[PDB]
RNA sequence: GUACGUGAAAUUGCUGAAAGGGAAGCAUUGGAAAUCAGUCUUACCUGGGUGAGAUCAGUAGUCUCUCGAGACUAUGCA
RNA sequence: UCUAGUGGGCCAUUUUUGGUAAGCAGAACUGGCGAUGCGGGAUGAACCGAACGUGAGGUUAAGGUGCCGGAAUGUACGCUC
RNA sequence: UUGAGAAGCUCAGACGAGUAGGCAGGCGUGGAGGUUUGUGACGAAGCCUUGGGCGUGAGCCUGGGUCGAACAGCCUCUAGUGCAGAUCUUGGUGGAAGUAGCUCUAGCGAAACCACAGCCUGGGGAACGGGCCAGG
RNA sequence: GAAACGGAAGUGUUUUAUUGACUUGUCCAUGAAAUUCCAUGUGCGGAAUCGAAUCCAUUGCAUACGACUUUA
């Protein structure tokens, strides 16, 4: 089944936050394989999605997606800042996100 | 007249009421909770037992100051009492509801207590409004298709 | 009905001019390219020519079953595989009107719109298959000459464990 | 770098605090972590140092002695255990003494940021958690220190069988001419 | 069941359905997400009845 | 100039949820020691002039029109020159007979009606 | 239905759903579930055919205003 | 020209007098809090930043970047177990 | 170019804590004069509602339900004109509690009290504690 | 259809006997499209049943009551 997955695995770590104030509009995403802020420049502007399933079979489907884009790197270790169309729920801390390769400049 | 419950549609139900009854609201509330859902014939036997102290009515919400008994082990609780004023009113209302069903032509061997409610009458002591709806046990018709 | 009946907030003259799209230097005609989205995601196809913004792309229909299609240059990866000879096939017939969806005319009556007695279908005409066959004939010898390329276009690109696209080169 | 669904860590030679902080961050990152050989963890400081630290802890609570329970306590203090997120992250950690049968046949990784040989200065006294636990109440040290040889002997036999089996393909590799005919790609 | 399209009227539906082999036409009038009326027409030129509905309940209810 | 709302939540009076005797209509706190008046952290917001909305888009419904209250056919005819700016809203106490007359007139004038389906049935 | 127009809140009972572990309610952001709102292509332009009628008659009268301005009544439809 | 409100203190710093087991007390001075929310300081009425219309984006201050906790288990040179 | 409610329209720049106190503009209620050739038994007013909308806000408009005879917008006049507190007044109703009482019972049946929840160790300087911070 | 091994929490490691297939090992011929530029048995409520347990004949062994222990 290794003829698929055009995307890259990622994890939703947290929102942008200070010690005591959280900003849910921007989320901190750890793209796996990206290990520094210079490698995070490749994934800037790429589409990222959160894919989950819900009980109702609305649209005749069991899966729904929240889309987003990668805006800028966060820190030195390769984490990025992502803004989603809808703010990611706080329950999705440590959940998985998919980073496509489009819009591609390669 | 209108009751608290959407049932009591004439075809398969029978109603009975008692308003401004000279009995305590809290004791009547506990008796209503116990006999709710029971079969009509089973409820009559249980109410007779409470009169004869064979079975105990488990005081459940207003259980403050109520002594526990072994006869409450059936209901999964401990506190219990043997009210006779509340039981007498409920027995009379059940007799009325049974008589109403007999007039309606209902099937008498399938009657269960679908809805029994106790409400606070105006403070005259605390009187009580009691309304009972007994309806036929609805069976499922086999599809056979 | 013609004299304006309202304030008529006419837009100010906007100084925006349409200028040709500057595509990447790696998206030359004939380069093998990986499709990123759509129903043909993961396929490898040959870039015939560049439209104004999109790339008129197709895989040899006898190879991967990707017909003459348009692809946005952002949803494509320009690989460094050896280029295919595409100067032979004329691409002047591939314009935006060639790929444009048919405009809605809908000649019906209010007797068959009810009951859904229309069944309007616009299956691909024969000339489109003829054009695809002509392109395939002019492209297959080019991909046959260079080795390990015919089935390379038949395969579908995918990412495996440990693949880092920011480090991998295409 | 990359994550797996379950990560098994061989805690032999790993510092308690360094490994716990890495594990706690991985637990909050959304990963299931299994730490085996929790009795082989190391703590910087002499035997008497952490002895008085644990003896003072005994003076204070449910005093746990098992090495995994020591490690589980260290990881828990590095988690937001007062919230649902911290509790959920805790339940993804499985710390055990030794390597149980479900895990001795699975690959075990190590954390270089927590290894004693790469973090402690040579010639510094250290206290093993298993040895430290043995005198403070833990009574299963001898039986687990005896069973490890049985696991090691079985595992060593497996490696020899795997190595002997691998020799056939390794010889067959250079035997096939196509291995070197197109080895210009670096493979 | 045929979804009502455009601006075809009941008499036009009736005269069109009379040529399709249908014999009775039922039109459910609804307004603000509630069916409240039903006009049944006997085809091709039979009597037309108009009822106003109430207490609409489905099987799940 | 699409419609932008600086805020969609209402301003509820402090402690209005705690007490049923206290209504939720906004009241400016007067207590000096009250943390809401001092505008501490985590406390509820207060009506400020900065929350005010754009003058051009003020009073505009989400469809870009302004609700104009209508009580008879004379009021509908007033919006002949302003059907792109205003929507007719029939008053609540206008009977179902007048509502019908208003709705037919507004239809010829090309005037949107906010509550054109009230108190009436349809029969095609 | 005389415990009688309307019938609020506090409060009480039953039923249904959901949440439960101790500062709590509350604020911010989204998820899920339930529910709701409005926004529709339909018209416009153009051509011909067929008939129609007036604010058109190389047209005849009446009325009310100030020659011509409105309202009509016959007759023809280029 | 007239015309509302106030006619205190606290934190104390600094200069400073007497001191007295030693602390401490006494003057002036200096500003702040007092009418002031916000970032930090584990938490904090007076410490470090900064003073406020509703928002988007960017960048910082004081503090920080093992985990809790956003951010290098960074680089280089030393002390200590 | 129509953009003269000249009390309108328009252009530009700067600024925005706030007690006492000062000064403007508004929202709402009862009644009065005028007005809308106003609304109303084809349903006024009130009330209910996880319906919709408008205003920074006071508030206002509206759908549905209930209901059954009156009522409102605008200009002006007028005042017994807006409540969470007063150990407020009157009325209604709670927890205590089916407790005190007159083992389990049978009947009858209170009152005081009530801002609100309620596991501990330390610190939060003005008690900080129960309510914050760090832990168990 | 299987036999062995695996005890620490073996729950899996092989050995296969075959029975069928894909066989990317490699070379060819067809089909892919107007998706004509991204959007992606299981649970509940009832019954007829089979056991078991409690109450129960019980008992003081337990005992404000609960609840407990023996025996019909």
Swiss-Prot record, chain A:
Its main location: cytoplasm. One of its GO terms (molecular function) is structural constituent of ribosome. The keyword Cell inner membrane does not apply. The keyword Phosphoprotein applies. InterPro entries: Ribosomal_eL33 (IPR001780), Ribosomal_eL33_CS (IPR018266), Ribosomal_eL33_sf (IPR038661), Transl_B-barrel_sf (IPR009000). It holds the Pfam family Ribosomal_L35Ae. GO terms for cellular component: cytosolic large ribosomal subunit; preribosome. Component of the large ribosomal subunit (LSU). Mature yeast ribosomes consist of a small (40S) and a large (60S) subunit. The 40S small subunit contains 1 molecule of ribosomal RNA (18S rRNA) and at least 33 different proteins. The large 60S subunit contains 3 rRNA molecules (25S, 5.8S and 5S rRNA) and at least 46 different proteins. Component of the ribosome, a large ribonucleoprotein complex responsible for the synthesis of proteins in the cell. The small ribosomal subunit (SSU) binds messenger RNAs (mRNAs) and translates the encoded message by selecting cognate aminoacyl-transfer RNA (tRNA) molecules. The large subunit (LSU) contains the ribosomal catalytic site termed the peptidyl transferase center (PTC), which catalyzes the formation of peptide bonds, thereby polymerizing the amino acids delivered by tRNAs into a polypeptide chain. Belongs to the eukaryotic ribosomal protein eL33 family. This is Large ribosomal subunit protein eL33B. It comes from Schizosaccharomyces pombe (strain 972 / ATCC 24843) (Fission yeast).
From Swiss-Prot, chain B:
The gene is rpl1701. It comes from Schizosaccharomyces pombe (strain 972 / ATCC 24843). There are 2 genes for uL22 in S.pombe. One of its GO terms (biological process) is cytoplasmic translation. Component of the large ribosomal subunit (LSU). Mature yeast ribosomes consist of a small (40S) and a large (60S) subunit. The 40S small subunit contains 1 molecule of ribosomal RNA (18S rRNA) and at least 33 different proteins. The large 60S subunit contains 3 rRNA molecules (25S, 5.8S and 5S rRNA) and at least 46 different proteins. uL22 is associated with the polypeptide exit tunnel. Belongs to the universal ribosomal protein uL22 family. Keywords: Cytoplasm, Ribonucleoprotein, Ribosomal protein. Its main location: cytoplasm. This is Large ribosomal subunit protein uL22A. Disulfide bonds: none annotated.
UniProtKB/Swiss-Prot annotation, chain E:
The lineage of its organism: Eukaryota, Fungi, Dikarya, Ascomycota, Taphrinomycotina. This is Brix domain-containing protein C4F8.04. The chain holds residues 124 to 184 of 306 of the full protein. Transmembrane segments: none annotated.
Curated annotation (Swiss-Prot), chain F:
CDD domains: Ribosomal_L32_L32e. This is Large ribosomal subunit protein eL32A. It comes from the Eukaryota. There are 2 genes for eL32 in S.pombe. Keywords: Cytoplasm, Nucleus, Phosphoprotein, Ribonucleoprotein, Ribosomal protein. SMART domains: Ribosomal_L32e. Component of the ribosome, a large ribonucleoprotein complex responsible for the synthesis of proteins in the cell. The small ribosomal subunit (SSU) binds messenger RNAs (mRNAs) and translates the encoded message by selecting cognate aminoacyl-transfer RNA (tRNA) molecules. The large subunit (LSU) contains the ribosomal catalytic site termed the peptidyl transferase center (PTC), which catalyzes the formation of peptide bonds, thereby polymerizing the amino acids delivered by tRNAs into a polypeptide chain. The modification Phosphoserine is found at residue 74. The gene is rpl3202. One of its GO terms (molecular function) is structural constituent of ribosome. PANTHER family: 60S RIBOSOMAL PROTEIN L32 AND DNA-DIRECTED RNA POLYMERASE II, SUBUNIT N (PTHR23413), RIBOSOMAL PROTEIN L32 (PTHR23413:SF1). One of its GO terms (biological process) is cytoplasmic translation. It comes from Schizosaccharomyces pombe (strain 972 / ATCC 24843). It is found in: Cytoplasm; Nucleus. Belongs to the eukaryotic ribosomal protein eL32 family. GO terms for cellular component: cytosol; cytosolic large ribosomal subunit; nucleus; preribosome. The keyword Membrane does not apply.
